[PDB]
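We modelled each protein-ligand pair independently. The example shown here corresponds to the chloride ion entry; the chain sequence is given first, followed by the ligand as SMILES.
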Amino acid sequence: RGRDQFVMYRGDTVGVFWNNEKDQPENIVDRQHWTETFVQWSPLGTYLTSVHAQGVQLWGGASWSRLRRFPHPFVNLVAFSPGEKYLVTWSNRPIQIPDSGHPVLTLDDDGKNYIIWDIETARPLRSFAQQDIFPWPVFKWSADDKYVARLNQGTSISIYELPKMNLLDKQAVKIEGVMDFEWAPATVQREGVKTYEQLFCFWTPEIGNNPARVGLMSIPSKQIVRTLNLFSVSDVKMHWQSEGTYLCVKVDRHSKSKKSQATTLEIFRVKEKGVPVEVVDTIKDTVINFAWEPKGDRFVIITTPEPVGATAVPPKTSVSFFCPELKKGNQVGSFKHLRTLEKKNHNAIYWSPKGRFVVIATVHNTQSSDLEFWDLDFDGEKPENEKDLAACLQLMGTGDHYGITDVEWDPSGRYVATWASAWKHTMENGYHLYDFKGELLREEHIEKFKQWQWRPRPPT
Ligand SMILES: [Cl-]
Ligand SMILES: [Cl-]
Ligand SMILES: [Cl-]
Ligand SMILES: [Cl-]
């Protein structure tokens, strides 16, 4: 059938189900109190993760039997390395080790919040305490599970090499003023580089007589392969493309008056010689959403103007598409504005994992629930003003879901699930099942629907 599994957690019961489109989901399993607080899928779909006060547990196999156990007390957040080789557990409450003894941890782990585990052996590799002075993950992974890093804001970036979890060159990367950083989501083959490397971007604000900058570092050489100096900058956001082909930096800027001014989008061509940087566009309003097309070269933003009165009426939002120009040959033209939609309340972007199709949504709002299903490679005639661009934008269908909180695409990019979680509000928990086109296949009301989550499937 080529169906996909998914999990739903309602009340105190969680179950793995087959997908039957409009027909009722076939149930592989259902259990009561499988988890205490939440349920999370392993990124390659191998494990189902349950969380308890004592520990976090990994369920899997045809039997759906226990596979691994990680005795971290009172975990709130859990993350995996991209290749499922390692596990990261976090607790807001610092670990308290009993004098009686802990079956795995020791006094060295007391007062700490993070633990990094080796899944295969279930043994803890390192323990870390909370930083001096919400976001997740904090420990960020390289694409190949070889490096994991944490930001020491204003000072350095501590990079560790696995499986030993040893500090690289017995030193943290000194970067004065470093505000944030992101690894590339893939192992990038830059042109002409024969050596192994992993890439991450970072940024610093203005320091003394040096301007604010965005950097691109190669690990483990720790060489900076490209710097980009920026001016009049309020804040910087760094957005990697899925293959690591492109890196877009969003820059919040200001006037000499230091009033809010404009936002600039600039793009790195990471694979190309010299690492060229291009100035895409400068936009007046603030950006509240940004999303690259997975495995593609298209991205969407959602903007909203600045409020002066903090007025009762919600701000309307504008969604804009950007795509590269058509270019003769196996190359990609310069990034250009494609189209801006009419003002509306949208505030969420959900690209398909395949990346042709994107769902523009309106979630966590009481005034509107609208859903839009768009195609970027529609078999149609491009309008005159958008004719040179490498895209054919077309609305494939609309939909709605009252009190919607979340949406998730299926791995195959054929189905879109939306749901109202009990975690945010209890008024009308439900899940909708759509296809890519936006046709409502089925919906269902569950009294205490906590979460839907597709089971990830890596391409064979
Ligand atoms: Cl099947
Ligand atoms: Cl952003
Ligand atoms: Cl987003
Ligand atoms: Cl697939």
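The two ends are 16 Å apart (CA to CA).
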